[PDB]
Symmetry: D2
């Protein structure tokens, strides 16, 4: 049987890509392709079982309520998710169990692994730094992922000593951005797409985890994994991490 995948924001960048990806997938059939303004009833009309939603922060809450109200599983890449947005989703889910919602900030599997690996490694090293590298058309430095990683690292190293640093003389910015006591350096280079390197060190050894996103469509295999696996965990899951089944 084809799993019946609906895509919201299907003319949006990510949705159109996902529509294509569902087409190509042997196990998935596209049950409905909706973009801004399409009645959500088209989803139930077509017996959608799971929806990919990468719409705007301003419609996703509309979408989710309808999806949960109707027992349609949701793989959500839309951002703007406050704790007040989150609880609302869990509130909606109370009334409909056996409905799985995934909200994840990042669907590139390599990125999710790296962040996971960084989390696991953090407490074992004296030093941790993040170097992030992106194309020079990038507006924010450091990237969200780098900031997300550094904060993860900081939390993992709670109650450890700070990164050792004997710097007493410096040019401004030499030491990167300080995100919760973790230096984050942002390289902007023509030729690059999205890259991130977490470096850990202790006298005697270092450990580096490097993730390279070479395509704009890196998220694809992860969204697909999320779609395939989403029913395995009822209720709300934040982050793609758990669906990777890491043991």
């Amino acid at each position: 049987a084809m799993a019946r995948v609906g895509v919201l924001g299907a003319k949006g960048k990510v949705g159109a890509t996902m529509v294509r990806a569902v087409a190509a997938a042997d196990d998935l059939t596209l049950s409905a392709e909706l973009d801004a303004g399409d009645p959500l009833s088209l989803l139930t009309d077509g017996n959608t079982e799971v929806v990919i939603d990468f719409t705007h922060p301003d419609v996703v809450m509309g979408n989710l309520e309808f999806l949960i109200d109707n027992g349609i599983h949701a793989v959500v890449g839309t951002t703007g998710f406050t704790a007040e947005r989150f609880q609302q989703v869990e509130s909606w889910l109370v009334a409909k169990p056996n409905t799985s919602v995934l909200i994840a900030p990042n669907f590139a599997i390599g990125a999710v692994l790296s962040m996971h690996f960084a989390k696991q490694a953090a407490r074992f090293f004296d030093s941790a730094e993040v170097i992030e590298l992106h194309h020079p058309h990038k507006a924010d430095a450091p990237s969200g992922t780098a900031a997300r990683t550094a904060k993860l690292i900081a939390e993992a190293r709670k109650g450890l000593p700070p990164n050792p640093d004997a710097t007493s003389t410096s040019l401004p910015g030499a030491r990167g951005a300080d995100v919760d006591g973790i230096p984050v350096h942002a390289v902007r280079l023509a030729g690059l797409v999205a890259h991130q390197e977490v470096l850990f060190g202790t006298e005697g050894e270092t450990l580096t985890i490097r993730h390279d996103s070479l395509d704009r469509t890196s998220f694809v295999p992860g969204v697909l994994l999320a779609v395939r696996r989403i029913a395995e965990r009822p209720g709300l899951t934040v982050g793609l991490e758990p669906l990777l089944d890491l043991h």
Copy 2:
């Protein structure tokens, strides 16, 4: 209140380093340093709680027997553990269920983390390769660790297609050593010590884990870790990994 640690093979290379390390540790008390011929009863006379044993394969079994018989936890870095010898350690332990033995081939935390990460990432990528790089005085290519690593990766990827590879024409060796369908390349270069890169790739993303050991004594933190935490797992633990408490 501080743990009373003893070291067997204390005049051997690793042994002497560990004595120093334990002397140097603020939370650990050296209760015995033995090497060849020193009666093991020195350990019980001095109220030893945990032992580091990096001694020879030919003496380590008798050490273990005594250690287990006496409720002394053992951190065992000495090699030579056949299936039979593992089985024998297990038997001795049956009689002593509160005693903990950790037998591990690698105490470098970064190398242990790196292998765990390789293992957790292996199934998510079309392609996986190991590059190891050592000083040019190394007899064996590839390193034990790299081989162990490729085996782990192969084992983790069972049921996935082999590494895609269109190679039709090659110079012998270009594609490296085949360890379980996983290419391992051994770089031997002046100026290096011990280094390993694990490269995973899929269309649109790569993930790289690099471990660098800059010291021959990079294993000391792991040994001290094993020594501080060994008692948490009654019985035999194989590999340091379970002690790292990876969630």
Copy 3:
């Protein structure tokens, strides 16, 4: 004034690309676009001053004679260039001075620099190795460039001791392909395009030069540089290196 660029093999992969590149270039005008079977007279009919030729090894010698006979400068990426082919070109050039021919195996500037840098660095280090990384659809291992680099390195280190190597036990292929005493390792990985790393080492330090070709169209800026600069040196030039004006 527009420099008048003709492209041979204009429906071929490289030619069509070059036609596009000439169009976009403010200083270049396409004077003639010829592909298999177009009479070369179209070139002189359109007052071509310089031709890009990435045709087949079986027509390039036809093309060159005509180009030199007619004082048309030639930027040649076609392969199959024997010393007997080379001399023929210089023979043809005798009769027409103030006609510049460039035959280069590689027009990616980053690749040409790397090879140059490798040449310069080679004699200063005890060890040199090449690691080449490519997409897994690649037929030859190691790549031509890697083999070309290793041979360059070997020549630069003539009368130096061999790479130190104490290996006495190994799996087959662990140490790479041996190209003139330089190990060449070939990684084939999904996600990769064309990458090459030359590693140099001496006790106390290493030096690595890494080139990444992320596009299929990497050669473009170099072919263009060659086109722009080709008249500066009369007669035959083999390799893009000299036109880079390195001091």
Copy 4:
């Protein structure tokens, strides 16, 4: 037949290392080791040909005066060379045209090569950045070498547009220190020594030069090189680079 080398500041850190190195060298004869207060005439009494001087800025000028006056070639690693002091060395040399003085701020061959390569590549790439990585006991960020390097690159790229950079929103420091419009990021990490990456990028290709110093004594080969070759360039040479004979 072997060169007679003397070392000034022979009880200083670098001095003593050089004495050992010269003792150890098969082609070099130690003809004098001096430090504080030893009469410079020891050098001429012992038929010294070349001197290594790594002494203090406050004594190096008097050393040089004597060295030059006596036709003794000088390899000068001591720092503190103002424009005036350079000018004064030049004057002394006028009277002694067969005498050679090499004053260099960096004797690590790999670091000198790397800087030369950066310089030769700079003009060919839209984007250039320096990443340096040191042990976490380093007072100054970025390193002198990295700063020197960025300055070199900037200088080499004059007349090309600045690094493309769309950064509009950033945490202070993310983009690193600006040295002449070239970003330099300083990584401080336990387990490291001295490391520098120069990253060049253009649409479709990147080039990376990485130098790793694994030792505090990685400069010894360069100093021995300078000592064996200094006489080839009469007069003052600044930087080791010209001595490397880069063609």
